[PDB]
Amino acid sequence: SHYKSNVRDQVFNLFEVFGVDKVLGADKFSDLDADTAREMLTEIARLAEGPIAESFVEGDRNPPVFDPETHTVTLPEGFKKSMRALFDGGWDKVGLAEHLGGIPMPRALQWALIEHILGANPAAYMYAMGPGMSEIFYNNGTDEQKKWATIAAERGWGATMVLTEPDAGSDVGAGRTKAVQQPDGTWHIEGVKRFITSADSDDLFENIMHLVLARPEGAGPGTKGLSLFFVPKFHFDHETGEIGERNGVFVTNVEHKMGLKVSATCELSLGQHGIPAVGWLVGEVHNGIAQMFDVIEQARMMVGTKAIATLSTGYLNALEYAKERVQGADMTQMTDKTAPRVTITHHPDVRRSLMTQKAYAEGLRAIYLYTATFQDAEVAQAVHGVDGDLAARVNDLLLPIVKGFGSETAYAKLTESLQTLGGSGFLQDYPIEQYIRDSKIDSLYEGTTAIQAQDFFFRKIIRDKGQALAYVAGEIEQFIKNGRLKTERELLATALADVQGMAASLTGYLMAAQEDAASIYKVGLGSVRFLMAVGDLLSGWLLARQAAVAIEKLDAGATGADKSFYEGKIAAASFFAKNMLPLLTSTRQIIENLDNDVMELDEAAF
Amino acid sequence: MSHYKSNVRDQVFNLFEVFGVDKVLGADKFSDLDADTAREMLTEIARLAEGPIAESFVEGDRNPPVFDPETHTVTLPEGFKKSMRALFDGGWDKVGLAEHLGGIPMPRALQWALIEHILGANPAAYMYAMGPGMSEIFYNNGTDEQKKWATIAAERGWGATMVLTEPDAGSDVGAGRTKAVQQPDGTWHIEGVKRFITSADSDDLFENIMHLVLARPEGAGPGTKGLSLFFVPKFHFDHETGEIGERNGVFVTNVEHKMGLKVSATCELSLGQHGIPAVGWLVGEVHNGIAQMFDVIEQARMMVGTKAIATLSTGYLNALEYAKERVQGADMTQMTDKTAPRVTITHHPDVRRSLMTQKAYAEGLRAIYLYTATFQDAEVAQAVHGVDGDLAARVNDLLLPIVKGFGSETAYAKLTESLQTLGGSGFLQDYPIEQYIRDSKIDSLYEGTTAIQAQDFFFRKIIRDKGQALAYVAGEIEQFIKLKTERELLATALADVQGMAASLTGYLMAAQEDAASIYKVGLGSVRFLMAVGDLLSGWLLARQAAVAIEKLDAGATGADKSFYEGKIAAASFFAKNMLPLLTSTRQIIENLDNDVMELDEAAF
Ligand SMILES: Cc1cc2nc3c(=O)[nH]c(=O)nc-3n(C[C@H](O)[C@H](O)[C@H](O)COP(=O)(O)OP(=O)(O)OC[C@H]3O[C@@H](n4cnc5c(N)ncnc54)[C@H](O)[C@@H]3O)c2cc1C
Ligand SMILES: Cc1cc2nc3c(=O)[nH]c(=O)nc-3n(C[C@H](O)[C@H](O)[C@H](O)COP(=O)(O)OP(=O)(O)OC[C@H]3O[C@@H](n4cnc5c(N)ncnc54)[C@H](O)[C@@H]3O)c2cc1C
């Protein structure tokens, strides 16, 4: 199959670096032990490498077909077979609450399991997000709505998040879809939404729960005026779940995309076909953007994990290719035109490329798993000694890194993966060109990189009063202040100071905006580079932490494949510190010298 | 209009206001081509590109070529063939062609500016039209008798291919195993399978195809040194009249399914395997293949770089047009006010950052390939630079890997910004940027990968050259440095690149005592190539800004004034936001070690 997994690195992170096994068999996870967690990782990785990856090519080459008269999509049969393999193993219920039929587990294990589906066929996981979205509806719902959410989860209904409109993408608060209150307390939703993932899904599911943002008639402007509504594809019996009459919510177009083709990306028309789109106000309160961000937070974690998953299998495909491809002589024998030909892993530029791919893939894996350790209060306490409030703020700080830095990094470093194959990398015979096309969406949906970087600075640092950022910086400082990693710790110290300098510069521009409003533009100009710098710093630190563990295991006497694995962690941490981190010094100097010339330029001059 | 957005204004600015190529127009080789006619030609081909050539850009990708095993041919979509006919009917496939082959003499700088439009609109169309130019290369390398066949080939507009690559010989051309067996009559029978051959068949576009095939005569030595070049036509023909005769034994056997550039048929080509012989004629009746074939490789490397730049330019201009109309969000100065007016996204800082990044690299790359082309005519190099023919050739050789390697990497990377500017809509096939990205990814791979470009640049174009071309260009940068802030930033960048060159040269020279030292050259080579590209971009943009300042002081108005204002802004932005990174890259190159080379392969 195309999909090459890395359970070994996952288990290294979960158990040898972060110690998530400390909570297994205790309190919420009393019924899940470490051996079982490992077995589940191996099991889903095998399922991903087999039946799920089997339709990865098919979904792209034979993409979904829309019938505009039935407002339905037909998915390729091979992809539906992969979906059934996912459902038959219960993998659309990973980490679902126990009362909804799930297996309780730390979020760090949950996302490690999901990584394999996202690497093998990411749209398959997207289609399978229904039960998790039903749990969010449960948590935000009235007692009666919790009964519907239980049905939806138990029956495996699909689900969507429905926000975007043609004129309201990044600016969610500009949305014009309306909600009209009915005497009996239901609402009729009227509007056209766009770019809705999974808004129809062929016959995968008995029903779909649309979670729709809409503006009640007479509500105020902006996101504050928006409410969230449960809008099912089919009406249903609220006691038994029996599916009833079709609700007035119809797909009216399916986009032709660069990649992720098997994910139906839809225009969704509500109340436009002479049938009301009945919706129920979630929680029977008007609090839409707050409620919908429970969904957005999960989707941003998913997109980041998808990016990392895809870079990982891209790297491992490139590595396998490089080990076998014979081309050229060793550089030490270039002059000799009779020298033996060698496999291309002998060439310095190929080893540079591979170690770049490796270090970023493994640094990103460490980042999303680190982030997830703050998503359970019990895990954050056991592994970090951090209380619930701080853990939540740290998770909030890291999500735009997982999403924003992960999405940008994975796409960029897949360029190196493709390059490693030479001309063959341009062929559809190999999976890397599809990885690139499928990953380009990651920087765009669930909030563009610029929106992630604005969220990160203004909301996760400034509004947070820097508490979460100071916590993470303190952990990096402690690592620095703890022989064989001295050069790496010195390089990390410089990188930490560089990022601190960037944060101070941008905060200074924000303060200056009290006096000259246009000074705020300099925050915008520097925001994305600052986000990427924090990502690089975290990557280098977590890689260096991994190298410290690897040194310990090597000193203790690791042999064989274990020894090679640990040796590679040391090499990745050292390579990243020496080749990636120093660039942050120049980025700091650039951010310190930002000016508004590019903002004052006449638009006609571009 | 079309997907293709051209930039004749920037081309003319470069050709005439910056480099002064008009100095040679109306004189000597170019006596019959004046400046007004050159401008009219650029405008005319730009309109052709925006019109009939671009018309089939989408069709070629969505309805790609089909291989027919019943006939060993490739079929092309009709709309694309209509674009090809528009190209030939206009006589565009003979721009810069030698006069005796029917061409219009012109400076290479003008030639590549004309070609940029075809490459931006539908680059495969130019590739299929490379026949006459390759026939001229055959003419130049051929016997007196062969010159007669090359004249027929160019006159009749035959297609042509360059046939080097094999399944086990890609970057390592010298490992090729395709064989040539001399026949009693002095012809050769070619036997082997070649891979990834562009335009290996082309439907009914042409009456014949000239394959220029590298092969190893029986008993020849092992290296590239042992390869010879052969003229292998698809059809035999009458060497005097050109009448097409019997099929020659050279057949396409598959067409590759590619990420992009789909309408360019990329084929496995089998010689002498469908048992009629592939008859070939030794080019020039001498054994000198790799030297002869590099005449073709040099033009192909210029083409790939120009293609990448052309595609980034139309990607940028599409993103700019979109950004000017897309209303989204309030101005950042009104972020708190959820009642503030919505603005077009060009008002947002990250979008202006993105657009200026795209602009500066697109225009810097255009300046680089036009600057390079000014060294490709001795008469232009003398007129515009005061540089003799020998130095001009060495400087052109130095810059070709920058055009190809730095251009290919840069265009693909900065198209990411172009797509991002469209938001979610950038991921749609409704807009052309996703196809630009797919079509552009090949540029870093064929006609020599980036790593091969960087190794050529350093080992051959610098070390073997004893740094003569490099010192000349560095001297011109230093003279400009001697726009004060931009000149200070350029001074730092020049010193940075000089430090990189010194470090890598040390690693290479130390290899005599410590063989593994050479690996550090390999580790740093691509970063060094890219740093040189960034330095050249920043220098040429600053040179453009100096001209722009002059024209503004002289009273420029209207659209001219806006253009010149944009050049000042691009040069300043590039100097302040791109060049400083070269300082960290220098320190990284100065710190290279062989830990990554000593690591066990199993540890990756
Ligand atoms: C679409 C397409 C069309 C083409 N059309 C033609 C054509 O018409 N005619 C033609 O002659 N060729 C053609 N080619 C081939 C092209 O010229 C390239 O040389 C070829 O694709 C690269 O060789 P390869 O694919 O075997 O990669 P390899 O040579 O196997 O390279 C694989 C990897 O190893 C690296 N590598 C290899 N050797 C070294 C070394 N010594 N030092 C450092 N790194 C090294 C490369 O950089 C690359 O990352 C085409 C290629 C493509 C993709
Ligand atoms: C494949 C796909 C699937 C999707 N699925 C869903 C789904 O299921 N549900 C859903 O609700 N949405 C979905 N979306 C919508 C997605 O969230 C939007 O595409 C995204 O938020 C960007 O919106 P837009 O496309 O309108 O771009 P715009 O908002 O128009 O952005 C255009 C450009 O302007 C920039 N920009 C805009 N505002 C600002 C600002 N204030 N500051 C700085 N820069 C700014 C952006 O960064 C971008 O570069 C999907 C999108 C895609 C591509």
Q: Are A545 and A362 in contact (CB under 8 A)?
A: no
- Residue A132 CA from chain centroid, whole number: 15
**Ligand 1 contact, B521 CB (< 6 A):** no
Say whether A206 sits in a helix, a strand or coil: coil
Nearest to A471 by CA among A385, A364, A546, A405: A385
Say whether A194 sits in a helix, a strand or coil: strand
- Residue B311 CA from chain centroid, whole number: 11
CA dist., res. A332 & res. B519, Å (int):
8
Would you give the DSSP letter of residue A67? Answer: E
State the amino acid at position B590 in one-letter form. Answer: E
Task: Tell me the residues of chain B between 407 and 436 that have a Cβ less than 8 Å away from chain A.
Answer: 412-413, 416, 419-420, 423-424, 426-430, 434
Domains and CATH numbers, chain A: 7-66+74-133 (1.10.540.10), 139-286 (2.40.110.20), 465-596 (no CATH)
Task: Tell me the residues of chain A between 440 and 479 that have a Cβ less than 8 Å away from chain B.
Answer: 440-441, 443-445, 448-450, 453, 458
CA dist., res. A103 & res. B233, Å (int):
69
Expressed in angstroms, the distance from the first to the final Cα of chain A is: 47
CA dist., res. B80 & res. B76, Å (int):
7
Expressed in angstroms, the distance from the first to the final Cα of chain B is: 50
Q: Are B303 and B126 in contact (CB under 8 A)?
A: yes
Torsion angle, alpha carbons of B280, B284, B288, B290, to 10: -70
Sign of the alpha-carbon torsion through B163, B164, B167, B171: negative
- Inter-CA distances, B376 with A257, B108, B207, B395, B464, Å: 42, 6, 32, 9, 20
Tokens of A157: 């209904």
Neighbour tally for A448: CB within 10 Å? 22
CA dist., res. A504 & res. A117, Å (int):
40
Q: Phi and psi for B244 in degrees, rounded to 5?
A: -75, 135
Beta bridge partner(s), residue B229: B214
Atom in ligand 2 nearest the alpha carbon of residue A260: 1
- Residue B379 CA from chain centroid, whole number: 23
State the amino acid at position A398 in one-letter form. Answer: L
Would you give the DSSP letter of residue A35? Answer: H
Torsion angle, alpha carbons of B389, B391, B394, B398, to 10: -130
Give me the active site residues of B, please.
447
Judged by a CB distance cut-off of 8 A, whether residue B356 touches chain A is: yes
Judged by a CB distance cut-off of 8 A, whether residue A224 touches chain B is: yes
CA dist., res. B11 & res. B44, Å (int):
13
Identify which of B338, B351, B416, B429 to mutate to test ligand 2's pocket (most ligand atoms within 8 A of the CB).
Answer: B351
- Inter-CA distances, A96 with A30, A48, A153, B286, Å: 16, 20, 9, 75
Neighbour tally for B593: CB within 10 Å? 14
Nearest to B424 by CA among A300, A167, A606: A167
Where on the phi/psi map is residue A21: left (φ > 0), alpha (ψ -120 to 50), or beta? alpha
Neighbour tally for B334: CB within 10 Å? 16
**Ligand 2 contact, A469 CB (< 6 A):** no
Pairs across A and B, CB distance < 8 A = 265
Using a CB-CB cut-off of 8 Å, the residues of chain B touching A355 are: 596, 604
Nearest to A312 by CA among A271, A275, A365: A365
Judged by a CB distance cut-off of 8 A, whether residue A327 touches chain B is: yes
Nearest to B533 by CA among B378, B372, B385: B372
Sign of the alpha-carbon torsion through B269, B273, B274, B279: positive
Judged by a CB distance cut-off of 8 A, whether residue A223 touches chain B is: yes
A449 Cα to chain B: minimum distance (Å): 9
**Ligand 1 contact, A346 CB (< 6 A):** no
CA dist., res. B567 & res. B62, Å (int):
37
CA dist., res. B105 & res. A376, Å (int):
73
**Ligand 1 contact, B264 CB (< 6 A):** no
How many degrees, rounded to 5, is the angle at CA A436 between CA A432 and CA A437? 120
Sorted by sequence, the CB contacts under 8 Å of residue B23 that are 6+ apart come out as: B383, B384
User: Cβ separation of A337 and B165 shorter than 8 Å?
Assistant: no
- Report the DSSP pairing between strands A208-216 and A178-181: parallel
Task: State the DSSP H helix or E strand holding residue A426, giving kind and residue range, or none if neither.
Answer: none
Q: How far is the CA of A412 from the centre of ligand 1 (A)?
A: 21
CA dist., res. A351 & res. B549, Å (int):
46
Q: Phi and psi for A228 in degrees, rounded to 5?
A: -110, 135
Nearest to B582 by CA among A585, A347, A158, A343: A585
CA dist., res. A414 & res. B286, Å (int):
45
Torsion angle, alpha carbons of A329, A330, A332, A336, to 10: -10
**Ligand 2 contact, B328 CB (< 6 A):** yes
State the amino acid at position A53 in one-letter form. Answer: A
Q: Are B589 and B504 in contact (CB under 8 A)?
A: yes
Q: At what angle do helices B407-421 and B518-553 cross, to 10 degrees?
A: 60
List the single residue in B168, B424, B604 with the smallest CB-CB distance to A169: B424
Asked how this structure was determined, the answer is: X-ray
User: Cβ separation of B259 and A437 shorter than 8 Å?
Assistant: yes
Q: Are A234 and A253 in contact (CB under 8 A)?
A: no
Identify which of A255, A300, A306, A448 to mutate to test ligand 2's pocket (most ligand atoms within 8 A of the CB).
Answer: A448
Placement of tokens 């007479």 in the chain: A218
Would you give the DSSP letter of residue B166? Answer: B
Task: State the DSSP H helix or E strand holding residue B367, giving kind and residue range, or none if neither.
Answer: helix B349-373
